[PDB]
Each structure stands twice: as structure tokens, then as C-alpha cells.
Design an enzyme around this catalytic site. Sequence first.
Site, PDB file in Angstrom:
ATOM      1  N   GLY A   1     -83.773   6.836  24.975  1.00  0.00           N
ATOM      2  CA  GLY A   1     -82.827   6.192  25.759  1.00  0.00           C
ATOM      3  C   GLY A   1     -81.667   7.391  26.244  1.00  0.00           C
ATOM      4  O   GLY A   1     -80.887   7.143  27.067  1.00  0.00           O
TER       5      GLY A   1
ATOM      6  N   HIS B   1     -89.195   8.728  35.704  1.00  0.00           N
ATOM      7  CA  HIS B   1     -90.011   7.926  34.848  1.00  0.00           C
ATOM      8  C   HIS B   1     -89.510   6.487  34.278  1.00  0.00           C
ATOM      9  O   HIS B   1     -89.872   5.864  33.901  1.00  0.00           O
ATOM     10  CB  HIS B   1     -90.466   8.821  33.854  1.00  0.00           C
ATOM     11  CG  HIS B   1     -89.400   9.012  32.709  1.00  0.00           C
ATOM     12  ND1 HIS B   1     -88.916   7.963  31.874  1.00  0.00           N
ATOM     13  CD2 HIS B   1     -88.563  10.257  32.418  1.00  0.00           C
ATOM     14  CE1 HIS B   1     -87.765   8.940  31.116  1.00  0.00           C
ATOM     15  NE2 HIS B   1     -87.634  10.034  31.513  1.00  0.00           N
TER      16      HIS B   1
ATOM     17  N   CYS C   1     -82.599  10.093  28.337  1.00  0.00           N
ATOM     18  CA  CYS C   1     -82.839  10.683  29.496  1.00  0.00           C
ATOM     19  C   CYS C   1     -81.929  10.427  30.473  1.00  0.00           C
ATOM     20  O   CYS C   1     -81.328   9.204  30.601  1.00  0.00           O
ATOM     21  CB  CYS C   1     -84.263  10.136  30.023  1.00  0.00           C
ATOM     22  SG  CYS C   1     -85.684  10.913  29.034  1.00  0.00           S
TER      23      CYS C   1
HETATM   24  C1  LIG Z   1     -86.250   9.594  27.921  1.00  0.00           C
HETATM   25  O1  LIG Z   1     -85.080   8.793  27.391  1.00  0.00           O
HETATM   26  C2  LIG Z   1     -86.975   9.943  26.913  1.00  0.00           C
HETATM   27  C3  LIG Z   1     -86.320  10.877  25.879  1.00  0.00           C
HETATM   28  C4  LIG Z   1     -87.193  11.514  24.830  1.00  0.00           C
HETATM   29  C5  LIG Z   1     -87.531  10.300  23.860  1.00  0.00           C
HETATM   30  C6  LIG Z   1     -87.555  10.817  22.261  1.00  0.00           C
HETATM   31  N1  LIG Z   1     -86.509  12.189  22.418  1.00  0.00           N
HETATM   32  C7  LIG Z   1     -86.590  12.309  23.848  1.00  0.00           C
HETATM   33  O2  LIG Z   1     -85.880  13.410  24.277  1.00  0.00           O
HETATM   34  N2  LIG Z   1     -88.280  10.668  27.480  1.00  0.00           N
HETATM   35  C8  LIG Z   1     -89.351  10.282  27.170  1.00  0.00           C
HETATM   36  O3  LIG Z   1     -89.608   9.255  26.603  1.00  0.00           O
HETATM   37  C9  LIG Z   1     -90.497  10.972  27.780  1.00  0.00           C
HETATM   38  C10 LIG Z   1     -91.172  10.299  29.000  1.00  0.00           C
HETATM   39  C11 LIG Z   1     -92.204  10.734  29.644  1.00  0.00           C
HETATM   40  C12 LIG Z   1     -92.834  10.187  30.931  1.00  0.00           C
HETATM   41  C13 LIG Z   1     -91.952  12.376  30.243  1.00  0.00           C
HETATM   42  N3  LIG Z   1     -91.633  11.268  26.803  1.00  0.00           N
HETATM   43  C14 LIG Z   1     -91.341  12.018  25.691  1.00  0.00           C
HETATM   44  O4  LIG Z   1     -90.418  12.682  25.858  1.00  0.00           O
HETATM   45  O5  LIG Z   1     -92.466  12.000  24.678  1.00  0.00           O
HETATM   46  C15 LIG Z   1     -91.965  12.763  23.641  1.00  0.00           C
HETATM   47  C16 LIG Z   1     -91.566  11.509  22.729  1.00  0.00           C
HETATM   48  C17 LIG Z   1     -91.174  12.040  21.062  1.00  0.00           C
HETATM   49  C18 LIG Z   1     -90.625  11.120  20.329  1.00  0.00           C
HETATM   50  C19 LIG Z   1     -90.538   9.906  20.717  1.00  0.00           C
HETATM   51  C20 LIG Z   1     -90.784   9.299  21.965  1.00  0.00           C
HETATM   52  C21 LIG Z   1     -91.280  10.437  23.033  1.00  0.00           C
END
Ligand SMILES: *[C@H](O)[C@H](C[C@@H]1CCNC1=O)NC(=O)[C@H](CC(C)C)NC(=O)OCc1ccccc1
Lengths: 304, 304
Positions: free
Chosen positions: A142, A40, A144
Site C-alpha cells: 500500500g 502498476h 507505493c
Molecule cells: C506497492 O504498494 C508495493 C509495495 C511493496 C509491497 C511490499 N513492500 C513494498 O515496498 N509494490 C509491489 O507490490 C510491487 C508491484 C510490482 C508490480 C512492482 N511488487 C513487489 O514489491 O514485490 C515484492 C513484495 C514483497 C512482499 C510483499 C509483497 C510484494
Amino acid sequence: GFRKMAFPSGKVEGCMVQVTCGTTTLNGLWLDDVVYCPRHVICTSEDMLNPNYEDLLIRKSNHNFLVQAGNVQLRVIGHSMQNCVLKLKVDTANPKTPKYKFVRIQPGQTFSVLACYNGSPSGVYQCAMRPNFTIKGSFLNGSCGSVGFNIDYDCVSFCYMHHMELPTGVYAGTDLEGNFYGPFVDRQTAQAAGTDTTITVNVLAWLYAAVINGDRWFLNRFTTTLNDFNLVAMKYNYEPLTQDHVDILGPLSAQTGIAVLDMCASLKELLQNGMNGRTILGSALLEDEFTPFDVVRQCSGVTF
Amino acid sequence: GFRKMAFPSGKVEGCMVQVTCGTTTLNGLWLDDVVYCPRHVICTSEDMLNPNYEDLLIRKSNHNFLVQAGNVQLRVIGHSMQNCVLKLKVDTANPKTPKYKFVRIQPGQTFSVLACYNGSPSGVYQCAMRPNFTIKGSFLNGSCGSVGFNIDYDCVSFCYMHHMELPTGVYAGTDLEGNFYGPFVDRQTAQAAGTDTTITVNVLAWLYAAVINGDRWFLNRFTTTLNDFNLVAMKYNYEPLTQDHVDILGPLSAQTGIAVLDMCASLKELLQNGMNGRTILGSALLEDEFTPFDVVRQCSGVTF
Ligand SMILES: *[C@H](O)[C@H](C[C@@H]1CCNC1=O)NC(=O)[C@H](CC(C)C)NC(=O)OCc1ccccc1
Ligand SMILES: *[C@H](O)[C@H](C[C@@H]1CCNC1=O)NC(=O)[C@H](CC(C)C)NC(=O)OCc1ccccc1
């Protein structure tokens, strides 16, 4: 003294890089001449609701992936998608690559996470792969591409790469072949993790840790049977205990002289009566994130 | 997600060596051309009841200290005792020496421990210097000379070296100038640590961490005053709260829109009513081993 301890992270620290594609920055793992990262990274905020990864990746070339190790730019000479991870071939083998393996860990096993932001280590803590294939952690935007691992002697066994947070506030990710643990998909949609069952064998291990360390107030005068205990476990959302589990506890049993089924009877009364304001090894609840091996390791001072 | 996280340990891993004197082996810290270690390395089991360290050290020469970094023998060209630590001058500067400082940490501040055995890292976890100058850890025989530290950017601030376990199952040690935290002495005698008071400001920080992370069930409709709150704190063995503490919480207060004295009123009712089987950030008790800075660090993803 008994504490939740992570592995020393130095070997993994030297593998972390920053990967940028367009506006999205996350972490990558640099082993030999390959950098692994969540696919992603190629998505824009719009794409993430319903991404067609195959079509998205097609509009990308090697030069669209910026890979930074400290302040040094790596040259991307190749890219491919394996399940939910990208593999970016770079022209330089990581000189700090440790002995390593990729392993798909079983539910109830533990590992250390090195939480990273922009390719830089933030902190380290110990987790378990829960029965419902989530983990309890601390990840922000950030994070991931942060990885989970075990160390046996000199060999780092990588078992987890971070991808997402679920509405429960627990987290989900993949093995290093890009296959999710659990039913999760890398899309921004509402996703159910099932009932969060408790890892019975690990609760028992930790009660043995308590006895070894002098906390013995919860030992009672009863025993039970596997079938009788498991009826109680089912009510409390505990995993059923099996003879394999009994066998695995056999070392701690022998060391303490407490039969596994006697400890089961103690656990049963703890589940049915609560702890009455008392603590075990400083905890007010039953902890299930130490494996038997963890308990033996910690109680014997195993080093890497 | 909110977790007890240690610093990445790689910078410290490269400083750890093994020090042997006679039959006693423990850990040493190798910075530049000096190795720091607990002075009780010179003791036999007999000596440890009532050691005359000055007389014991006099029967020792440079060649009686064996210092091993991995499998490489360092050459000791000098030795001296500073308070409760030995400094062994070696003929080779550690090429892996990080930027560093020695700092005597205040009670209620936190640090990471890298637990070591025979000069080799075992594991890493986060601790606090408790008000009574003990720490809650996991140390076994052979762990002495393990160190506690903080990392600010690239600089490692070493604050603790491990020396002993107390009858409570908590631990005691020195700063890197060899001065004990607390009233402890390096002798095998019964030693009182006083009442284990709770670090009020840190409990408050952690309640702010909960609110930031969505756990808000404990917020009530009351406020209080400093003097009224502190009357309650005294009964529960909490440290008195001061305006300096209020000021330190000001960032978390502003971020959450919960006045510090409103949070004090919530804490008061938690102390007086217990948690009724409920949890906060997954804990069944009030946690006091996160500083305000820790909470901001973790909630903002600070990296090193
Ligand atoms: C990758 O860095 C990110 C880490 C998430 C973001 C907030 N806490 C985490 O562990 N992963 C994502 O943004 C992910 C992307 C999708 C295409 C899989 N989406 C996600 O985790 O949505 C939940 C979320 C919660 C709170 C803030 C942002 C996203
Ligand atoms: C140094 O490696 C050792 C670490 C202790 C041993 C057990 N758990 C620890 O943290 N420190 C000592 O052995 C210390 C030596 C005195 C001269 C200060 N004595 C001590 O800690 O006595 C308590 C003790 C408890 C259990 C086993 C052995 C000693």
C-alpha cells in the site's frame, strides 16, 4: 548531539492523494492539475508477474481511475504513461502545491521519505540513494507512490517515488519522470541488486561530525595517500575516494584542522581493527548515510 | 524494512513562532490565542548563571515580547509564568491550531521532535524519554522552545519543550505546563543526570520487530524466569521487567509464537556474549527507543 533528521514534511503532506484502479489502491502525488503515481496501479495480482503495461493501460479510461484527496473525489480528465509512472490530469489544480522541482538524485545523496498508506501520511525518515541504487526503508503493501524529497528554502525537490521491495529487504523506485534508479523493472520477478558498496565520502563526513561534537578517540597518529587508502577501501567494498571528494570535505577539514588524508588513515585503522566495542556518535558501526552537506546543515542549524 | 520514523510534522509546523525578548531569540508554540515558550527568554547571558526569574519577569511588560509568525507581528496583550514556561496571550487565535492535548509522557515512551530555529522548522526525528529523563537529540543554540509530540489520528499530544543541554551531550526540557522532566533546573550550572538505564521492554519489542522482519539468528534454545532474567538486567543497567511489561508484549509474542520469557533468554545471551560482529535490523547494538506500540504501528502501517 548528532542525529539522522528528516526534513519537515508539511509541504509534501498536502500533495498526497489516494489513487484506486479496480482493487489496487496506492498513493499519488498531486501537483498543479496532475497526479503522479506508479503505473502498476492498473495491474491485477495475476498481471504483476509479467505485465504488458501498454496493453493493460489500453483497457483503461479516465473514469477507471478514482482519485481521492481527503474525502473529496477529483475528476480525471486525462491519463498518460511516462516510463513507469502514470500522469492523471485532473480538473482542479492542487491549491496546496508548493514551489517544486523534479530532480534525478545522484548515488550517495540523501533525501527524506514521507511513507504513506491510502493517501495518508504515516511517518517520515531520512534515506540515501545507495551506490547500488537501492534504499533502506520501511515500506509495506500500500506504500507505493510514497515520495522522497529535499527542501531548499521554500522549494521541494522531488527525487523518488516508491514502487517495490527486493529479496534483500531493500527497496527500489523511480524518479518523478518514471525512470527507475538502478537496473530494476516493475515486474514481480527475482531481481538482483549488486554489491552494496559503502559511501566513503559520507563515512568521512560523519567522522568529521564526531570530532566537531567531541568524539575523538579514533583519531590516530598516521596519514595516508589517496592510492594507498583506496587499496584498503577496495577490500572493504568502499567507494574509491577522489580529489572531488577531498574538495567536498574541505570545509569540514578546515573547521576541524584535520587533513582529509589524516582522517582517511583513521578510517583505515577503523576498517582494519573494528571499533573494539566502542561507539562513535552512539553508533557501533560506520554510518554512510550523511552527506557532507548534511553534516554542515545540521551543525549550522539550517532552516527552511 | 524497519526504521526509526517520526510523525508527519505539518500540523506542528503551523504552530511554531519566533519569540524575542531583548537580545534573546527562541521558538514559541502558538495554540489558540496563547504562545508558550521557555521562561529563560527573559534572561541576559549574565542572568543565566543564577536567574531570579520572578524579579526578572517583573521588569518586563507585554510590549517587551516580540512574537513573529512568519513575517507577521503578533500583538501581546498578556503574559504570565507557569513553572518554567511563559504564556503570552496574543490578540489573534492561530487559524492553524490543530486538535491537541498537553500530556506528561512516561519514561520509555517515544515522541517526535520538530527542531526549530528562529521560529522556522529545521528537521524532524524520533526520540524517547529515557529512564533518567533525558533525550538524545541534536539541539544547538536557538533551538529552545522546539517541541516533542505524538499524533493519535487528528489529535496532536504535545509532551516536550526544549530548554537545555547537559554535559553528557543529552538534553532536558519540560512538559507544556513548564514542569521539567527529571531533576533539572533552568540555570547554567553543572547538572547530573543519573545512570542511563536501558528500556528493557523496548529492546524486547525491537527483537520482536526483527523476528517479524526475518532476522532470527539470535533466537536460542533456552528460556528463563522473570527473577532470573532481572538478575542479568541489573548487571547491565537494564530496567527490571514486570508482568505489566510481559502483558504489553503479549500481542508481539502471539504474532511471532515466541514466548516473552524465551525472548528474554535470547536477550540474556546477547547481553552476556555480545553480537559477534553481527547486526540486528542493521544495528550493531541493542536499540531501546522503539515502544511495543511503535513496533505494532510500524508493522501495521498506521496512518494519521
Ligand atoms: C506497492 O504498494 C508495493 C509495495 C511493496 C509491497 C511490499 N513492500 C513494498 O515496498 N509494490 C509491489 O507490490 C510491487 C508491484 C510490482 C508490480 C512492482 N511488487 C513487489 O514489491 O514485490 C515484492 C513484495 C514483497 C512482499 C510483499 C509483497 C510484494
Ligand atoms: C536554548 O535555545 C538553549 C539550547 C541549548 C544551547 C546549546 N544546545 C542546547 O540545547 N538553551 C540554553 O542555552 C540553556 C539556558 C539556561 C538558562 C537553561 N543553557 C544551556 O543549555 O547550557 C548548555 C550549553 C551548551 C553549549 C552551548 C550553550 C549552552
